């Protein structure tokens, strides 16, 4: 749910994506 | 009983995660609950995972903790092998693609070689998806296995830790250590491999790019690299706007909390419209910060879409120009373009990885600090009734010793009494025997089991029966005897549920006396050998203590032949106890029995001395903004597909003399289409973000009007928490979440459609494979979206009891170690952690299940696309095949977003309908008709008449008032008195038309009020409530929120009110900031403020509700004295309880039932011997 990133991350960067 | 199917599933099942398919299809049919949930694997259970860590920590600690994280090392080491294989398989698609484009171009070649490449491409892509999601499974498992282990270790440590070390941290910080720091080590376990993987992925991507084009390819890498710090700077600016928005939000919610609470007074004064404008003034300040956030976000979605173009343009423009002999082929153009999209992922994920590894190193340090604290020495007290020999105790490892030189021995089955002044170490003495304090020198031992009763009673939130039982088998006869003996039956009967209820921690609140009485009983029921009572006597009365002491603690009570050492401030029960021990600043001054110890005259003698909801959101944003955004969106996606199709024509042109003929002409047109694309991306991004602010403004103003037009019945039936949650949660969703989601959803949906259009434009035979794959995608999405939300919900509700339990444990550490029930509370914590993982484990497998199905449909699209090209070689050109396959190769990523943002949409759109919930509800009468408007005739006399009037409280109920017929002349002072639950209160609600007249009529000055507008009535008459609440803000605003009349008028009103002395010569004269329902000002001041409000309007009909109810008898006289002189010619209809006020009037009306029982003069009704005479006698004053 990041800035200028519609990259799909299978990772949980601290969840609450 | 109900095992995990993974362990009893075949090899192929485990590879493709087919064993969860049963739980997915079930989750659609019916809702999934905590019972319909598998048992954990043996190797995931707390009792297997936790003991391996605490063993290695004990071993490692001896030698003197990333060295202790070679516990989960062996399993996690397998991760490296799968991830390494994935990185080399990743650069197979582009390498195979180059051969396939050369094949289609090389006309005179063996045809079969084509089919071989397209087969080899599908096989390569399908081993990639399988190996990837094997790598992710064992990463997400190892992270889950760390969480279980860390929580386990922290909990065990929290019991053995010493008081000195626990005083270092807060109860919050230790609960946050289990909640935040342990949670980060689930996440770290995933992306920690990307530290070595991403640089290796970048290094390869650069090198394959270099061989394909040349040194020219740097120009492309430069752009993508320069986007990373632009993404960082803009991601920082949004965070500062988010905090600025959040601070302004709380001001609006805090004001709404006052409005929702104090609507009852707000309606009576007609202050609905005034406070509507006041909330809107704060709302506009919040919508200006979102408007600044909207412009920024637009640039966020701009850079994302135009990056893959800008990179392509910059690289080809450089390559083509620098030398004329550089020919751009399909095999160069589309392979490099595909490599650039492989190169794009690692650079972007690298700033998030490094960012998170830093934050993990903060959490790693916090754990290392907490784990490596000094535990209590267990063999300080022997545990072979109680004896001490020259014991010295500190609270901290090095500190001035608290207790110094104590040597006392207590016979078996005797009552000992510790006495002295405050801060003599009498509190510390019992903490020393329990081995909480650190020993310096001396010998201490206690014989048999020990039962403890602390000063500050600890009561864990469970069934009050199971609280006193404290994990023991029930014995009904004995349980009855101790509850009776503790004098808990008088308290038990009062409690709503009675025997079994909830605790004040999270439920019905118990008083200080009741908390001690449960805590005392808990120890009594246990029936241990030795008892250590740390001042149980904090009860309501000494009469209560007499019953407890004699029946429980004393020699005639329960604990007759049991050792019971007690410490107390009381001097009453000393002559009953056997031996008394006097202390003096941490030293036993003198020991002896009550009789002999007084005779010596020592220290003891001195001591005694739904598509509908989407359409509702469409009408909210506005149709002009809606249509303009959809038009600009389709303009972008068309301008995109044409530019990629133009690139695929630029490739296909012959080489006349080592030159590509027209290249600058094509390069320009390719550049132009990109600007035409980029402009329209910023268009619909801004259009949608602007639209989101229009809906946000509309739906807030719509909701806020709907609430205030409601009657008070709505605010009684509807819970306050339900309304507050609406303004807080649901608006925030419409403001931030929905506008960002709808552009990500539509963006994804039309990228998938866009990719299919190119495949069909390249190969028309592609049609046949579109319905089969689409039908599969629909069904896998259907089950996931349904089942996944249930599992995430179950996980979020099952994690809250783990933190709730640990917080209770941390408070009652002294008790748990006194009774020695650690083992019980360990299993209690292991059970709760397992119940959280039981929910979390399906949740993570559900993601692996979907990902294998979606990527398999992704690999089917790239298979058929590339295959049909080989079937129709002789028709197509090299450029179209490049473009067709290169697009199909990106489909897999969009399908993930399309399924996610489908699920995110379906949850967020629910909030839109719930903001329009109170749109069609029952609304009160029109605020002003302003057709039959009242003139200035009402104050001329002030006649009031009820004509057979009657009201109900509820819509369907027995009548509260009935047959109410009486006439009141202008200037008459009328009294209304009765018994409790008569309905005299309801007559005030009827006069102000809160509830509309159930039957009959009500007249004021020959002009019926039932027909006339509410606000025209509400202003013309004034009211003094029971508890006049003050709204937070100016005192100038609090008196007159409209600020219509002069400031001298406000002064002369406060002068007559006799509140001149208050806010007279304070620097805050008129603009004093009130807050918290008028907490700054005292009880008496509030009555004078609401009197001043009535003295400002100067209306001829006033009403008083509980004017003399719990008053200090200072403002009571000032109220009555002002009423006499100021309202001398004005009508007043007073609702009073006390006779003193009622006695001094011209006329009085008395009703006990719904009907008017008696009426006349106070002096007349005393002589008549009516119900007034009976009321006056029962009151007392005759």
Numbering used by the authors:
A (entry chain B): 1 to 17
B (entry chain A): 205 to 268, 314 to 633, 643 to 867, 958 to 1530
What did the published study say regarding this structure?
CPI1 comprises 17 residues: an N-acylated D-tyrosine (AcDY) followed by 15 proteinogenic amino acids (Phe-Trp-Gly-Asn-Leu-His-Trp-Tyr-Tyr-Glu-Gln-Phe-Asp-Ser-Thr) and a cysteine that forms the thioether linkage with AcDY. A cryo-EM structure of the CPI1–bMRP1 complex in the absence of substrate and ATP was determined to an overall resolution of 3.27 Å. The overall structure of peptide-inhibited MRP1 exhibits an NBD-separated, inward-facing conformation. CPI1 binds at the interface of the two transmembrane helical bundles, filling almost the entire transmembrane pathway. Residues 1 to 13 of CPI are buried at its interface with MRP1, where they engage in extensive hydrogen bonds and van der Waals interactions. The superposition of the CPI1-bound MRP1 structure with the LTC4-bound structure shows that CPI1 binds to the same site as LTC4 and interacts with many of the same residues. CPI1 interacts with residues in both the P- and H-pockets and, because of its large size, engages additional residues toward the cytoplasmic opening of the transmembrane pathway. The solvent-accessible surface area of MRP1 that is buried by CPI1 is 1,580 Å2, about two times that of the binding surface of LTC4 (796 Å2). Because of its large size, CPI1 sterically obstructs the large conformational changes that are required for reorientation of the translocation pathway to an outward-facing conformation. In this manner, CPI1 traps the transporter in an inward-facing, ATPase incompetent state.
